[PDB]
Design a protein around this ligand. Sequence first.
Ligand SMILES: CCS(=O)(=O)Nc1ccc2c(c1)/C(=C(/Nc1ccc(CN3CCCCC3)cc1)c1ccccc1)C(=O)N2
Ligand SMILES: [Mg+2]
Length: 295
Amino acid sequence: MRKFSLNELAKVTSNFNAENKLGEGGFGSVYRGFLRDSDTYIAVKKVSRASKQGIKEYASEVKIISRLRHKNLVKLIGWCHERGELMLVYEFMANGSLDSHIFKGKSLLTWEVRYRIVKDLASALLYLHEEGDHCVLHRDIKTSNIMLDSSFNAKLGDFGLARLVDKTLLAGTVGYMAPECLSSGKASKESDVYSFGVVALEIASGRRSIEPKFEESEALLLVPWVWESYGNERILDIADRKLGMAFDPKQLECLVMVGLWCAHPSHNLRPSIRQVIQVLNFEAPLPNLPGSMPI
Ligand SMILES: CCS(=O)(=O)Nc1ccc2c(c1)/C(=C(/Nc1ccc(CN3CCCCC3)cc1)c1ccccc1)C(=O)N2
Ligand SMILES: [Mg+2]
């Protein structure tokens, strides 16, 4: 990666023209930038200085992402810290973020691609939690933070809330936050695994955690409805309607039970991400879950 000047970033984004906006990132808008000399595109995130948290999330992102290299993690390809303006530069990924496919119908993700994506995300988390000089707690795992390459391989990004292990402000995304986050404030590997659980269930079901859009059910949230479905031996009902019957039932069961295990209300009953990967690959047994979600 390298240092970009404000002027060159202005030039390649056409002064951050609205027609070049790709979407909203976690702490700024992202713009498509065109490199004339390479005939290639990049993605430029322009940081929002509208709270003080903008500069904190930029600083966290640079610090953390600089320490990470993995096939299932987004790579930083440059930065800019010049006058007041803070910016971050990444590869342009034409398939965009996972949420656009699974919730917004940009494409129909096949069962085989979805199961692969969950394994990709699990690999990323294993690397974060266990493979570095320091454990990295991500703190904002969700499908809008998962990028897709041309082959639909998944890369986890957004390190603006991420922290190295050896007091943080309570922060995160409502619908992905473990209950102990709100009661105690404490982030852990187990709180990251909770968010992974929620994501796994979103991917299986094509339903957003906070807005599942049930027509025949009164549940307002995804996880309780999945848990109730599992306890009534209705795992098949969980699967994204759009898939019809084109999915593997054994893998669906596995995905759902792993998701609930990860999303256990009690942090001490959640698996390690390494145990999750073993179960997803049928190298270790399915978890023993109660049929009712614990209160
Ligand atoms: C870690 C998540 S983040 O905070 O956003 N970080 C991030 C980091 C690197 C990135 C992107 C995002 C990104 C996006 N691409 C992108 C976006 C949209 C589209 C879709 N067309 C359709 C035509 C009109 C413009 C948008 C294509 C690529 C994108 C931007 C915002 C929201 C989501 C994706 C990309 O190519 N490289
Ligand atoms: Mg975030």
